[PDB]
Write a protein that binds this ligand. Structure first.
Ligand SMILES: CC(=O)N[C@@H]1[C@@H](O)[C@H](O[C@@H]2O[C@H](CO)[C@@H](O[C@@H]3O[C@H](CO)[C@@H](O[C@@H]4O[C@H](CO)[C@@H](O[C@@H]5O[C@H](CO)[C@@H](O)[C@H](O)[C@H]5NC(C)=O)[C@H](O)[C@H]4NC(C)=O)[C@H](O)[C@H]3NC(C)=O)[C@H](O)[C@H]2NC(C)=O)[C@@H](CO)O[C@H]1O
Length: 183
């Protein structure tokens, strides 16, 4: 199951808390909880700004140029996508991750009223994609939402654990909570 193997948030949180001044800046700019940004950093890279994955996600918030990067750039009115170089810059990385969270929050995920579930929707949508999250409820965006609103955090987490194709989906929520406890 997804609680396995357990995760000790403390050190990843210890190194992620160092960027808080930046997360506060980025968070204010994009209307995003600075701790949520910090939680993702901790879960995604453990706070190393030079992090590069197998799938080729970059930096502190582990952004993929060709998806989240492309999306933020489009939100800005810019063509193309960020270079790997930009994304290793902590500030560029964090602001762009925060921008991506606001994009999710005001696009695909618009409509979640319960902010605790919403914060759950965001970590799963961030790490595995919004559409992937939504199609576990229905192929229609608005129907998927109305269902989501009839759940409490514990229920939404249930549904994720068994109706979400990716096994890691529910584990991000767990790591999340492990990260918020460690703040
Ligand atoms: C190595 C290390 O140190 N740590 C690893 C860590 O890297 C691993 O996790 C990885 O995390 C990153 C981000 O944290 C993951 O990146 C995800 O990947 C998603 C899957 O591809 C991606 O979802 C897609 O995003 C697109 C853009 O938003 C979606 O397209 C858009 O659809 C919208 C509606 O749905 C539409 O309105 C837009 O027009 C459209 N835009 C475009 C440009 O297409 C697309 O639908 C969506 N896919 C799905 C299925 O929903 C996320 O955007 C992307 N997030 C970010 C922030 O980049 C990455 O996938 C993870 N790695 C791997 C290999 O999967 C972690 C794994 O457990 O391990 C750590 O240790």
């Amino acid at each position: 199951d997804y609680t396995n193997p357990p995760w000790n948030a403390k050190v990843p949180v210890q190194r992620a808390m160092q960027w808080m001044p930046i997360s506060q800046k980025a968070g204010a700019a994009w209307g995003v909880d600075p701790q949520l940004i910090t939680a993702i950093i901790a879960i995604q890279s453990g706070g190393n700004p030079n992090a590069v994955s197998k799938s080729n996600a970059i930096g502190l918030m582990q952004l993929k140029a060709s998806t989240s990067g492309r999306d933020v750039y489009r939100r800005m009115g810019w063509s193309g996508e960020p270079t790997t170089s930009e994304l290793k810059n902590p500030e560029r990385n964090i602001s762009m991750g925060a921008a991506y969270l606001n994009i999710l929050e005001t696009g695909p995920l618009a409509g979640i009223e319960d902010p605790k579930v919403l914060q759950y929707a965001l970590v799963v949508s961030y790490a595995n994609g919004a559409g992937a999250l939504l199609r576990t409820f229905s192929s229609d965006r608005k129907k998927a939402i109305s269902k989501i609103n009839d759940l409490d955090a514990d229920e939404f987490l249930e549904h994720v654990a068994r109706n979400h194709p990716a096994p890691q989906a529910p584990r991000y929520i767990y790591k999340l909570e492990q990260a918020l406890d460690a703040m």
